[PDB]
């Protein structure tokens, strides 16, 4: 099984062979077609303090076709179009898992870098030809097969924004802000718009103003222009901040209505929180049930990510561009190019 | 009408005569019996950036007896025991006011330092013999008259903690933390305990450990002892932080359960918010309806503040002690001493 991974934090991703466990009774064997490139992949293979275990094979925005299934699998059959996100296992018996929030389980097994009985001791991600996952964590893709690659980013970037939008009830009659026009930001705008909310996108440069409009934002604000920001004082029900290194959170807090919340999902003057009972929260990905709901919703609405397909040997160059925001708006690996 | 106030930020509080408007059709004329001393009073008369208008007459934890009422007043009659908090008026037609949240009204008139048609142009507080307030903002005291002085602090310190405890649903089956053992903290413990929650009080010194127990805390933690803090990891449903200058908010955030919130009411590693969908919020005082609910609740449960009665000419010395936390736990002025 071919894949692409790193041997150390300072070594660029390179070709390497890995192994996969034989499908167990509840397992689904998947032939990976495409894998989205997430900033978490970059961080994992480069960050010194990511607790990264090598070799490291990133990738967790996986879509492909079922090759085989265990004798106890009830959800899938060979030929099915499926997806895998950031979770491949969880304890299944804690309050979070029982509530369909496996993403918040204290013992959640991540698609990559988590301990597992499978060789070599830690999970290897989607930058590979195949993956074997317990059916509870495998999602069903309902989009037409021609859109598989564009569906890939939904498995992480998509759910990461979909989950909080749903949790804070974005929808008709709600004014929702989306900060950042990158991989996460573009999905936040697409989804908030599809949910029926009045969407305001925030950027730090005039260069991406038209781009935000094109994504579905009803209004766009350059957060560096005080006049533009002031026009939205105390008007937002919810603000989804997707910027990696969010700045001027004070400015955004003042844009929230009473009882409003700004949730951060990217990788604060108390006075402003107190005066209107506002809150700042965080959120990461989503549980499996909601990830499935999101995929169904996106399939019915024809929602997919805007992507740029690349070869498996171009991931290092892709990372460089991602750091400059030089992609519109998600890189997706054509896993067939592994061979 | 005698009172105590300041002429400048650097001038200690001193005796001064003030005037009150004649009771209008909806007004209640109150003979003030006692007035609690709040940190906001101190800040108002000393802070350079408090937008303070002089003369400044603080005080907004007022209790007294109705002397007269306008011909349109329907809630009160002469002889009634009443209270006044931080609010004396609001617009009455915005979403907040209509929801019983006059405290979050953008045009709320504070008991002191807010513009008003009444001479001298800004509101004068409870460090006086009498006050005239629109009946919508006057509360009814149901406690026995002998407890009037101890009821005074409920008008601000009380509602400031009662409101968020109710908003975040503190009660049986909930583990609630209260940070700080001062004026606000002691009320937070008393109220959280009365609401039926399992209460954990947090202090920064061993000196107040027994005091916290005495107030009703089921458990006490010295936040400076990592071992004590670690024993409560991811276990709180809600944490009410009452410390003026809260520190180590990161340590407290990690003590919150998934979807838990820590609300600040006193005068943060994003990672910890994201990993468990936690939030940090703010809250100030409470609307009138809830302030009344609180007073009724406290009357039925025999809840009052622990106070130290002082003369009106001892307020400056009181402030000094408050800054050192040298009071158990609220100073209350005997307004009769104004003469
Ligand atoms: Zn990701
Ligand atoms: Zn679990
Ligand atoms: Zn106060
Ligand atoms: Zn109002």
From Swiss-Prot, chains A, B:
Cofactors, names only: Zn(2+)
Residues given in the record as Zn(2+) 2 binding sites: 91, 94, 97, 105
Pfam families: ADH_N, ADH_zinc_N
Catalysis performed (reactions): a primary alcohol + NADP(+) = an aldehyde + NADPH + H(+)
EC numbers on record: 1.1.1.2
Name of the top EC class for this enzyme: oxidoreductase
One Gene Ontology MF term: oxidoreductase activity, acting on the CH-OH group of donors, NAD or NADP as acceptor
Binding site for Zn(2+) 1: 38, 60, 156
Cofactor descriptive note: Binds 2 Zn(2+) ions per subunit.
Temperature dependence: Shows a constant increase in activity until 60 degrees Celsius using butyraldehyde as substrate.
Keywords assigned by UniProt, alphabetized: Metal-binding, NADP, Oxidoreductase, Zinc
InterPro entries: ADH-like_C, ADH-like_N, ADH_Zn_CS, CAD-like, D-isomer_DH_CS1, GroES-like_sf, NAD(P)-bd_dom_sf, PKS_ER
PROSITE patterns: ADH_ZINC
Family according to the record: Belongs to the zinc-containing alcohol dehydrogenase family.
The protein's role, per its UniProt record: Catalyzes the reduction of a wide range of aldehydes into their corresponding alcohols. Has a strong preference for NADPH over NADH as the electron donor. Cannot use a ketone as substrate. Is a major source of NADPH-dependent aldehyde reductase activity in E.coli. The in vivo functions of YahK has yet to be determined.
Protein name per its UniProtKB record: Aldehyde reductase YahK
Organism: Escherichia coli (strain K12)
